[PDB]
Structure formats: structure tokens, C-alpha cells
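Hi R.,

Quick one: here's the Alpha-like neurotoxin BmK-I sequence you asked about.
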Amino acid sequence: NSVRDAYIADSHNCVYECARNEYCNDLCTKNGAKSGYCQWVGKYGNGCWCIELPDNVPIKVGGKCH
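And here's the predicted structure, written out as C-alpha cells:
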């Protein structure tokens, strides 16, 4: 699998919080995903969720935002 649906993360393992679905669709797609939307509830609470994000871009994994 070179793509996955998940919360996109920065290089510090932190999700990107969101107020708008479009903010997330833009963020996800400019990083190669198919689309994205804002999750206001989810495994890690508020943050952008991307569909088919390539695996050279980070996703939130277990651990802290550091």
C-alpha cells in the first residue's frame, strides 16, 4: 500500500487542526491525496483526514505531538 486514508501529520507527529472542510481538502490534495475533509470527532479528535495520501507524507501515528 503506497497510499492510505488517515490524519495527515506534520514532521512533529501532530495533526493539523481545522475549522473548514476546504482547508483540509486543499492541504490533502496539494500533498497528493485524492481529497480530504475536516474531522471534528475521530480517533485523534479534530483534524484533517485525507483520502489516499501517499506514503512519503506523514500521518499521525501513536505517540505524542512533539
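The longest strand covers residues 47-54.

Cheers,
M.
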